[PDB]
Amino acid sequence: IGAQDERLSTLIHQRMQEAKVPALSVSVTIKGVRQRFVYGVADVASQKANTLDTVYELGSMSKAFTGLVVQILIQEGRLRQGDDIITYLPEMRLNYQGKPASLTVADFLYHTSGLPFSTLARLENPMPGSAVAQQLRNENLLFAPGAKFSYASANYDVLGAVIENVTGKTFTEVIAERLTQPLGMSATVAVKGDEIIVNKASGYKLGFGKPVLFHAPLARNHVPAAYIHSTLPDMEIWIDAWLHRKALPATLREAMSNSWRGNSDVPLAADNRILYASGWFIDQNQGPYISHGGQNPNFSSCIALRPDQQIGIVALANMNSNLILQLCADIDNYLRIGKYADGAGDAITATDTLFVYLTLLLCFWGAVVVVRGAFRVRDYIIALAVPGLVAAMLYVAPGILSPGLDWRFILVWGPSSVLAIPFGIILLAFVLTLNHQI
Ligand SMILES: *[B]([O])([O])[C]([C]C([N])=O)[N]C(=O)[C][C][C][C][C]
Ligand SMILES: [Cl-]
Ligand SMILES: [Cl-]
Ligand SMILES: [Cl-]
């Protein structure tokens, strides 16, 4: 062989410096020749380095593990795609137009279920003795099952429970017995909680311009959608199984083939005719190009394969960034035509700089009132009610402007600077009524 590609290393350094992720691990496969780029720190405080041993949360790239398991179960005749979900989760009643709806296993595999957006807030919150069927019971679907593609993370939590019901085994054990042990992915695992994982990267999240350590929720029921843990050597083996199925058992080979068959039975938009398969996006354009991003509150990742060209790309990072969600598109552009686009924008970054300006704008306002005021019973009670009256209005405001949304969800996904905005808003109300009391 020969050296790794330096134009390729520059791209990734640039994207990593843009995205401000503490650690970034990328692997690129092109017909056996793997290139590896392993940069940064898995833990910033201890200055613990990013190594090949570092473990990441895969985000939505967990769904291809879940979905392939479903396809193994189907291929062994222990399940059908058209089976009704209530056959396996019999307490899950899901409503469309007031009537219980028929949802097939296919409906959750391909996001044609109609679960509202707020099911992500419900599944991602830990609840110890609460099953998925009980958490979604009496949800009001957005459309008739099968009618539209609409991505909801929680559809793959429904499938986690379906695996658990069919096999009689826990989700961890089906993933191990069926995927990671037969493939050799000896460091990958579906977790059961926030128990201590050796070598896991610390997760970060933008706050006042810098990465801030964030301990994110890890709800057991949400692991089939968001919290399978893995490493770069193991995603390389993953990538390589999907690309070379000959050595694999015939059930795994067949299950894989049916895992890349996109659902063509949904409406398509004028600019998006990409299909969804069993945890993958399918694009015939400059393809087939099979891809999926990973996006957790404090990890992001991406994967993309171009099987006819023996190409696999995967990137892992311990911070949620769109520069990483797009990084596989960048690398595939580079491997295809030698050029790539400028880095896209990031929604957490724009929100953070907005909150910094608003925090300085709130902080400039209070100092004006305190300087002009200091230079110059009923007072204590009245000037304490108004800040608590705004604090009350602020607390109810999410669950009104967007039903099903709440501060707990805002805090989990937004910048660490969110909390400055209500606290700034209510603190500014106290100094003004105390000043208006003066
Ligand atoms: B997946 O689509 O990357 C999914 C994984 C998860 N944590 O459930 N992530 C999202 O859908 C991102 C939702 C952002 C909400 C503001
Ligand atoms: Cl089994
Ligand atoms: Cl257990
Ligand atoms: Cl092959």
Residue numbers in the entry: 36 to 411, 430 to 491
Study text:
To design a specific inhibitor of colibactin biosynthesis, we targeted the colibactin-activating enzyme ClbP. This membrane-embedded periplasmic serine peptidase is essential for the genotoxicity of pks+ E. coli.
